[PDB]
């Protein structure tokens, strides 16, 4: 007439080619015939209810209503945590296949694989600031859990798939806009270093944002040579 | 008995081959036995008094005196200035060679020849913070008055006889000593600028931190690495 569904309930059968439906938080059943089951109803409430259906009269008739009206435990054998692409998101009512996604997972395990920030991906952390950046992925799990979120405008000056002209950072290529103009560091490494009393006036160079430096000062006037678009570094004696 | 000087009085003579004594205010006297003379007493006030003295009798008798009561006037040609050293000097009391040296003298107005300052000289305007500056001459004169005095020390450089370094004011060639090792101008353009498909440079030697003009042409700004300061160019 009723009853009452286990705290983990798995496996129903409604009695008699009669047929269950139900009436849920959401779709997480799994139903065959009179027969059905409940996969991973983490934190699902409602009711499955065997309804005949003479076909001619046309009208329902409830003959058994298993019933929930409490959300379940946890269980095993049901992941609650799912890829949005590449990203990790803990089903909040889910369920291998039923995962009800909402919010993207922090991180504080070990053994990262790999982070990925402002589009490019670091494996080994020369030149970022720390290495624990953006969204980084652990060596098992195939998707990336959010660590922080550090501007991509290192100071003044915008790390972006769309930009003027590439540095290099880490040693993995990227991409770089100028977000202003005011002197300041640039954060990527040089990507190339064009050339040109024993020889007189000597110099090696590069092209640059606008009054951004990277390192090194010249290693002789010890500061920062900057012109227009360029930098140099002279040697002579 | 006793006589006041003319306004420019100038010979003397006591009477009975009788010696002259000089109470004054100051040295402007030369005297000849019983006769004296008053060689440019510019201020000059005093007594002599032609004493007399008997070898017999031990009896002094002063048998005329003559009195400047008043100072006297400048007088004729009596130079009532002179050069100490090179630099025009006035004539507190006398003149010619009697003249007692006092201030020097400014310079009033008239045709300066040359100007010396900090130990060097100059002619024209070319480089100096201001012409006529520190103290200059006229033609008709060949001495040094007083005309300004500003500091031989330039926003922390020093223009000065000795060391370390000589560069150049107008025509005239200069040295100079630092101050400190605080960036700042030189007050004198470079001694030699020497020189040195490729790059190039001119180059010249320099106190710490100071820059002659100009700014380098390219990266627009003085670079100074040490004693030196470069002026590039590239294709
Ligand atoms: C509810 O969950 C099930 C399982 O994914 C879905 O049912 C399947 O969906 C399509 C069309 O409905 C069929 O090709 C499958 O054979 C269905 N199987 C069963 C047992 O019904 C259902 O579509 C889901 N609906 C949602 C999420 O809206
Ligand atoms: C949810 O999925 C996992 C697999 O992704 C199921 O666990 C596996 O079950 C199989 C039998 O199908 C076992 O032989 C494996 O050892 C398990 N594999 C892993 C990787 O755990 C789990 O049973 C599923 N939940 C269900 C069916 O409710
Ligand atoms: C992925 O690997 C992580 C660790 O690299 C595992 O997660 C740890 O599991 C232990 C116990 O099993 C817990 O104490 C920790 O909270 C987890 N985080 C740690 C220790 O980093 C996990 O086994 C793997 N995930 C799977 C099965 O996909
Ligand atoms: C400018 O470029 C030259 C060659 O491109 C640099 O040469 C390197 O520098 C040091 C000493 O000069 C050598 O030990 C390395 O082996 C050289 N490496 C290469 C790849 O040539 C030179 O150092 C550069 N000068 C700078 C940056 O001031
Ligand atoms: C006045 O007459 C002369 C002018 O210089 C001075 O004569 C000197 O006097 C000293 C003693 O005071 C003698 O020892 C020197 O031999 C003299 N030198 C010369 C060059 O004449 C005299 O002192 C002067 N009186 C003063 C300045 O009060
Ligand atoms: C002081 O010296 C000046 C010279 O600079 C004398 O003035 C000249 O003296 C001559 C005779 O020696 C006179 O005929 C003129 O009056 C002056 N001529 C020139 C060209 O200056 C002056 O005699 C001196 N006075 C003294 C010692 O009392
Ligand atoms: C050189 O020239 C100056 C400037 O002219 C002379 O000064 C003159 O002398 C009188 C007083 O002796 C001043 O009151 C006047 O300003 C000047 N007179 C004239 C006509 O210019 C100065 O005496 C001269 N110095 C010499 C001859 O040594
Ligand atoms: C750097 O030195 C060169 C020669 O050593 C200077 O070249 C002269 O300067 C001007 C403009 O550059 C040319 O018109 C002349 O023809 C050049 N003359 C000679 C003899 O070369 C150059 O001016 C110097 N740049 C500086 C000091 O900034
Ligand atoms: O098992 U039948 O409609
Ligand atoms: O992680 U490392 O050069
Ligand atoms: O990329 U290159 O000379
Ligand atoms: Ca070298
Ligand atoms: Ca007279
Ligand atoms: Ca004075
Ligand atoms: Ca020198």
Redesign the pocket.
């Known amino acids: 007439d009723v009853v009452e569904m286990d705290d983990n309930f798995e496996f129903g059968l409604c009695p008699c080619d009669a047929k269950p439906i139900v009436r849920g938080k959401f779709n997480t059943t799994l139903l065959n015939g009179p027969a059905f089951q409940m996969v991973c109803p983490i934190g699902w409430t409602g009711t499955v209810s065997c309804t005949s259906f003479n076909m001619d009269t046309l009208a329902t008739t409830v003959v058994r209503t298993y019933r929930r009206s409490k959300p379940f435990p946890h269980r095993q054998g049901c992941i609650t945590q799912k890829n949005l692409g590449e990203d990790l998101h803990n089903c909040i009512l889910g369920g291998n296949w039923t995962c009800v996604p909402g919010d993207q997972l922090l991180y504080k395990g070990g053994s990262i694989e790999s982070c990925k920030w402002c589009g490019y991906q670091f494996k080994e952390s020369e030149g970022l600031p720390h290495y624990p950046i953006g969204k980084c992925k652990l060596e098992n799990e195939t998707g990336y859990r959010l660590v922080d979120s550090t501007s991509c405008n290192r100071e003044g000056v915008a790390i972006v798939p769309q930009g003027t002209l590439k540095c290099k950072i880490g040693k993995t290529t990227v991409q770089v806009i100028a977000m202003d103009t005011k002197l300041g560091p640039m954060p990527c490494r040089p990507y190339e ?1 064009i ?1 040109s009393e024993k020889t007189a006036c000597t110099f ?1 160079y590069t092209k640059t944002l606008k009054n951004k430096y990277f390192e090194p000062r010249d ?1 002789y006037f010890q500061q920062y040579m900057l012109k227009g678009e360029y930098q140099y ?1 002279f ?1 002579l004696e």
């Open positions: 270093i050339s090696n290693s570094w040697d």
